[PDB]
Amino acid sequence: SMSVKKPKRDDSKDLALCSMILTEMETHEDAWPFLLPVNLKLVPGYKKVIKKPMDFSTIREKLSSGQYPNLETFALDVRLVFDNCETFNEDDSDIGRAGHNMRKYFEKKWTDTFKV
Numbered sequence: 001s002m003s004v005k006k007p008k009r010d011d012s013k014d015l016a017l018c019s020m021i022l023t024e025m026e027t028h029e030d031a032w033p034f035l036l037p038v039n040l041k042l043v044p045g046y047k048k049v050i051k052k053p054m055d056f057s058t059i060r061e062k063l064s065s066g067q068y069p070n071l072e073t074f075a076l077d078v079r080l081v082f083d084n085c086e087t088f089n090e091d092d093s094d095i096g097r098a099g100h101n102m103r104k105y106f107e108k109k110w111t112d113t114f115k116v
């Protein structure tokens, strides 16, 4: 509260660390469904069903241009990729499996990087 400062984590390396995580994501063999925005002209349903599309190229651009206020906003966009993937794709399909794999990959890096 006013004039009562809470201790806060050192956030100075967050940008570099999130960039590194995103690079690891981008180069994963199963990243292929997530590299570019879902093609709204070619993918019937997508536009209407998925209210907030997100993908790794969009996140990279946002990260490179100061559009994440903090590391949590970054993680929210990463998780949004995988949440959209699950909404739109069967768990059993190649894309749905890829999404599950990439979510797991991401969360382990997230915990290992930012949870002490």
Ligand SMILES: CC(=O)c1cc(-c2ccccc2S(C)(=O)=O)c2cc(Oc3ccccc3)ccn12
Binding pocket: 032, 033, 034, 035, 036, 037, 038, 039, 042, 043, 084, 085, 088, 089, 095
């Ligand atoms: C993430 C997702 O739901 C998704 C991703 C693609 C896709 C897959 C392969 C290459 C490129 C893309 S993208 C990001 O350019 O859309 C995809 C494709 C979908 O429908 C198809 C599938 C085959 C042919 C045409 C459209 C549906 C969902 N996604």
